[PDB]
Structure 1
Amino acid sequence: MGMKETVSNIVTSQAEKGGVKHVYYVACGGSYAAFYPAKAFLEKEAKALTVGLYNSGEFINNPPVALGENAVVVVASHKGNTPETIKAAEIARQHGAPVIGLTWIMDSPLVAHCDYVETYTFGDGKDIAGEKTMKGLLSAVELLQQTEGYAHYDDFQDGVSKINRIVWRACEQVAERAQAFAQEYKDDKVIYTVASGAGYGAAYLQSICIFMEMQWIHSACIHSGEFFHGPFEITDANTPFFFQFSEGNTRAVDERALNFLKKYGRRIEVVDAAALGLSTIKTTVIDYFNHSLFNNVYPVYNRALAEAREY
């Protein structure tokens, strides 16, 4: 089970040193946003663990004073060659913090600077239960479970047992809509994304994908809660919105934003976790599966778009 033995080993080694009190997720690029679910998890669920999510550049230049024997550092680099991330592992080990590295390349330079190395599923026919985002999440779940206890551990593991099926079925479900979407937006140059909660990172990554396709302007990834507290992104540019409608504790925040956008007759492509079958996961843990769903369904849309025209 992802991360369970690794975490066991760390909890054992650090007991003598006062135990694990601080968790740091450190990466760049796609690997940074892929750790947002783990951050959201520990913020919501923990009482005696701190969590920090850091860009590798910022961590190595300005490391927290809590970095030391009561910290664990989880670094991610897909190819295992990102220099700032490697330096982050080194600095952590120099401070006495056990390092877990997440990489797809098991003989990469990063591996020499980690205490533990974990890999994940990637590419063709990837099993979502073992993907990089889910291993990040499982590090947080196991760290909580093995230090303070986690009341919804079994429900979480239930979710892991269901998510691959949910995702691949959703990919088929949206295939046709994706073709239509592609025809409607093929001549747009800018598209905003919108999201909230533990899946927000997947909306950020989708903003990058849109920019990689259109190559015009990197536009905002808008937090659903922020529309009523700033200037509305409604101008004569007529920018459309790719709207991530979550399941779980922030669904109501999303629903309020969506209703607003509809009242102004905006062009909106909605991807809705409730319509794509996520709701079989228990409501105690479903927030944490939004990222894995959307991050794995958007490619169907992105591929259709492309045809119509650091992980």
Structure 2
Amino acid sequence: MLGFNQDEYLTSAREIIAARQKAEQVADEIYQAGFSSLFFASVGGSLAPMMAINEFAKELTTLPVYVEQAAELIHKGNKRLNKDSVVITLSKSGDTKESVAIAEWCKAQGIRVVAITKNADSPLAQAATWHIPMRHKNGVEYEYMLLYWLFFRVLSRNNEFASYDRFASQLEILPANLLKAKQKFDPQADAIASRYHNSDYMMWVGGAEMWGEVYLFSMCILEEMQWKRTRPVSSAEFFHGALELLEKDVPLILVKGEGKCRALDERVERFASKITDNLVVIDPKAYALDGIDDEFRWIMAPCVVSTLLVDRLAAHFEKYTGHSLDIRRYYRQFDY
């Protein structure tokens, strides 16, 4: 497939599955020591999986769980962040300034920190209590998986996730299913990109546990890496003003969930189908997850969508725009 190497992808899966044990050990140490609140703090694309965690937490736990933009958090402080909190950070490079900053800030206050990053000698890990190795090359799904073993193991220990053992083992067969999903979607990825690569404006709609997917793809891929103008908006909030912008020629790409807010997504689908000639539906329910219990599909869904968009759809956009995904005109190009 264009812009894909199966060996690299399966190497990534093996490396992340090899970190399951460490993620579970960190979870167990956090639970056994005790904690007040869990703060998932990051910036940019690494927030997406954390916003999915927050959405799962809303339903599944009474524990205090928060997701925070790390620059806002270090400026404001937070009255619920205290010496018994655990702050979870994640950075592909291990150097991301805002993540290193919050980890160092916590360390100076005696607040425990998890660093999910490749190297134990990174600035992020050097500021942390625990390190979970994160050794994939490509795929935001692998960020989700490490966060899932960590978070859902805490919930299991807290008597709030009786299905953990099945979930955690089945999560290991997610990558093999994602590879199949990539193959199924690749032609549609090409069709979408062929049709919309020169669009002046695209509306991107989703929500709840899917919001992170929309948030990341729109800003971190389309805007940052293709210079395409987007309007990301939640399914629920679409009907409270953004809907007025939709018209026959306006692309709207709807990312659907498999949880309890799927009905909110379907409302958008029904409206858009009447108003625009340019509706694209990205529905993870179209993709099999063989060997995975259907009760876990709502949790897996953001990973399914990520593997389609961040990989396949990005590669096909790049094909038609002729704009390398690695170009930046400002980001990290000068001091600001």
Q: Shorter chain as normaliser: what TM range?
A: 0.7 to 0.9
Summarize the Cα distance change of 1:172–1:200 in structure 2 as closer, same or farther, 3 Å threshold. same
Percent of aligned pairs sharing the same letter: 22
Q: How big is the alpha-carbon RMSD for the aligned residues of Structure 1 and Structure 2?
A: 2.3
Choose the corresponding residue for 2:203, options 192, 195, 201. 192
Quote the Cα distance in structure 1 between the aligned partners of 2:281 and 2:82: 44
AA paired with 1:296? T
- What residue ranges of structure 2 are gaps of 5+ in the alignment? 1-19, 322-330, 332-336
Choose the corresponding residue for 1:46, options 61, 68, 75. 61
Note if contact 2:49-2:144 (Cα within 8 Å) is conserved in structure 1: yes
Show the 5 A alignment for 1:92-131: 92-123=106-137, 131=142
Deviations 1:32-57 (A, max 9, x none): 2231121112221002x111111111
Show the 5 A alignment for 1:78-227: 78-123=92-137, 131-208=142-219, 209-217=221-229, 219-227=230-238
Larger relative helix fraction? 2
Deviations 1:96-133 (A, max 9, x none): 32210011233211111001111224226x695xx112
- What residue ranges of structure 1 are gaps of 5+ in the alignment? none
Note if contact 2:94-2:124 (Cα within 8 Å) is conserved in structure 1: yes
Farther-moved stretch of structure 1 (66-75 vs 145-154): 145-154
TM-score (normalised: structure 2): 0.82
- For 2:25, the equivalent position in structure 1 comes to 5
Note if contact 2:209-2:257 (Cα within 8 Å) is conserved in structure 1: no
Task: Tell me the secondary structure at the aligned position of residue 40 of structure 2.
Answer: strand
Deviations 1:69-115 (A, max 9, x none): 33111011211112221121122223332210011233211111001
Note if contact 1:74-1:101 (Cα within 8 Å) is conserved in structure 2: yes
Quote the Cα distance in structure 1 between the aligned partners of 2:85 and 2:132: 18
TM-score (normalised: structure 1): 0.88
Aligned length: 300
Residue 170 of structure 1 deviates from its aligned partner by 0.7
Deviations 1:202-258 (A, max 9, x none): 1111102122354253x3212112232324153569330122122232222211210
Show the 5 A alignment for 1:281-292: 281-292=292-303
Task: Tell me the secondary structure at the aligned position of residue 36 of structure 1.
Answer: helix
Note if contact 1:121-1:132 (Cα within 8 Å) is conserved in structure 2: no
- For 1:56, the equivalent position in structure 2 comes to 70
Choose the corresponding residue for 2:315, options 275, 297, 303. 303
Summarize the Cα distance change of 1:279–1:265 in structure 2 as closer, same or farther, 3 Å threshold. farther
Farther-moved stretch of structure 1 (272-281 vs 259-268): 272-281
Quote the Cα distance in structure 2 between the aligned partners of 1:180 and 1:292: 22
